[PDB]
Design a protein around this ligand. Structure first.
Ligand code: FAD
Ligand code: NDP
Ligand code: HEM
Ligand code: HEM
Length: 399
């Protein structure tokens, strides 16, 4: 649920709409529905830029993409109403046919994006990228139907041009430039370690120091023969300065390729650190809940803080002893730090981690990273136990 931490972003959306709605109503009230749609298109592109200001205004990349989907759906609904009220299925003039083609592409892309979970991610992205062609066709449609009306010194022309230009620049940057210019952290793989049957640890030496906080993630691009170069999000599992650690669990073709075939000495690139689950910014009393590979951000803290400065209760649930990672590290940390309580849960041995008799310390922050249904169940239980307990969770998927 959205809170004040996203109030900067949502207000920016709201101010975007009213200013549009008040402008068209002042000049061409008959084009409120399509003009508003244009704004919601532009914002959509802006919401895909992954810029730091975006995740500062919306507090989370997950919330950024939720708003991205909301603006997409609003745009398509407004465009369908505009098409129904203005024309039909195919226009007579080229300007109308541009809008027809743009709306067809938009509807097809939204249908594929929603019902495209099982499509390969890169093919899904390539299909998604046709939004830029649809948007360019829509811009042509608008600027041929409205001629000098949008090419003069007035508020309507400046508003429409500013939003259209921002959308065009955002789309161009995210599609053509982001993977080429926004990945300045060039590193080499120095060490690889297989933690268990399906998890591998990767050590990267970078050319420049990398700044991050424990609990944050980054997008990684691997440059090796037989590997895909698309960026994948991975939680930083440790490292400081020019050294970075990533713990990758086999969850598909790319991660299986990492597990079996990734070699030392291969080139990698990283963009920057993302994430709102900064552990060091929480309260003094903390409860850490990890499920499986969701343990990765917490390890980042442990490797970087030899002496624990918080009172931390850690609950690590893993399916079996063969699915556990970093058990020796966790045991050594718990022995070294008296204020670190460790609770290992074996799902095939004892059962589910249930927060009904286990208590939450007063004025404590809960950090969760695990399977999403587990996170829902545990969040419900903890919220019922203490309504005034802060909960922060990190998801491992954008759609
Ligand atoms: C913020 C964040 C942090 C993560 N941290 C870790 C971590 O520490 N360790 C770890 O093992 N995994 C982590 N993941 C998950 C990791 O990104 C995916 O497991 C991996 O990208 C899937 O690659 P694949 O081709 O092997 O899987 P696939 O079989 O291709 O995909 C399986 C799932 O991964 C998603 N996915 C696939 N490719 C991408 C992509 N390029 N970008 C985003 N999602 C994709 C699909 O939507 C699907 O839900 C994290 C994900 C996010 C969003
Ligand atoms: N932050 C996130 O969004 C995270 C998401 N994931 C994703 O989930 C997938 C599975 O990864 P993996 O690490 O193998 O996960 P597992 O399925 O092994 O889950 C980890 C542990 O959570 C337990 N668990 C699962 N569901 C519940 C539940 N509803 N209530 C209580 N405990 C539960 C499991 O017990 P059992 O399965 O025996 O019931 C297991 O011991 C991956 O694709 C991964 O990316 C995983 C962790 C982090
Ligand atoms: C504020 C921006 C817009 C204005 C001022 C506008 C204006 C118009 C007008 C006047 C028509 C009447 C058809 C004609 O000229 O014969 C029309 C039709 C249409 N518009 Fe738009 N439009 C806008 C935005 C959009 C966008 C962004 C899309 C699609 C992505 C779109 C899709 C359509 C479609 C599909 C038609 C029907 C074409 C037909 O059958 O004749 N419009 N628009
Ligand atoms: C008018 C509608 C939409 C527009 C203009 C649009 C635009 C974009 C663009 C340009 C990108 C970046 C593509 C790239 O990385 O090359 C993107 C990413 C994304 N879009 Fe959309 N999109 C729309 C609708 C949707 C819908 C309906 C969904 C539903 C799930 C969605 C979910 C996503 C997600 C999850 C990403 C992140 C991709 C990644 O993780 O790399 N979008 N969007």
């Amino acid at each position: 649920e959205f809170s004040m931490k996203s109030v900067k972003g949502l207000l920016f959306i709201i101010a975007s709409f009213i200013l549009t709605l008040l402008t068209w109503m002042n000049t061409s009230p008959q084009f409120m529905i399509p003009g508003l749609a244009l704004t919601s298109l532009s914002l959509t592109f802006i919401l895909a830029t992954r810029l730091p200001l975006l995740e500062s205004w919306f507090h989370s990349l997950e919330k950024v993409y939720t708003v991205h989907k909301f603006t997409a759906f609003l745009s398509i609904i407004l465009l369908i109403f505009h098409n129904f009220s203005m024309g039909g299925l195919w226009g007579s003039r080229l300007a109308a046919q541009f809008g027809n083609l743009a709306i067809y592409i938009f509807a097809s892309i939204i249908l594929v994006a929603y019902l495209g979970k099982y499509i390969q991610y890169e093919a899904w992205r390539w299909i998604h990228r046709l939004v830029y062609l649809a948007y360019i066709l829509g811009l042509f449609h608008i600027y041929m139907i409205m001629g000098n009306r949008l090419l003069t010194f007035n508020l309507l022309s400046f508003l429409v041009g500013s939003y259209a230009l921002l959308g065009l620049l955002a789309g161009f940057y995210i599609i053509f430039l982001y993977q080429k210019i926004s990945f300045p952290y060039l590193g080499k793989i120095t060490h690889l370690k297989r933690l268990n049957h399906d998890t591998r640890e990767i050590q990267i030496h970078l050319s420049r120091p990398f700044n991050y906080q424990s609990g944050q993630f980054a997008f990684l691009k691997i440059f090796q023969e037989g590997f895909e170069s698309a960026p994948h999000p991975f939680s930083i599992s440790g490292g400081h300065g020019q050294t970075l650690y990533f713990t990758v669990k086999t969850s598909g073709d790319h991660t299986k390729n990492i597990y079996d075939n990734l070699q030392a000495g291969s080139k990698v690139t990283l963009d920057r650190a993302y994430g709102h689950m900064i552990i060091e910014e929480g309260r003094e009393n903390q409860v850490w809940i990890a499920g499986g590979i969701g343990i990765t951000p917490f390890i980042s803290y442990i490797r970087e803080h030899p002496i624990l400065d918080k009172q931390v209760h850690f609950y690590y649930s893993f399916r079996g002893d063969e699915n556990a990672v970093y058990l020796d590290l966790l045991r050594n940390y718990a022995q070294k730090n008296p204020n670190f309580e460790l609770h290992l849960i074996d799902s095939t041995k004892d059962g589910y981690l249930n927060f009904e008799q286990k208590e939450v310390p007063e004025h404590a922050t809960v950090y969760m990273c695990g399977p999403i249904s587990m996170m829902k169940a545990l969040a419900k239980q903890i919220k019922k136990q203490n309504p005034k307990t802060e909960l922060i969770y990190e998801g491992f998927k954008f759609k």
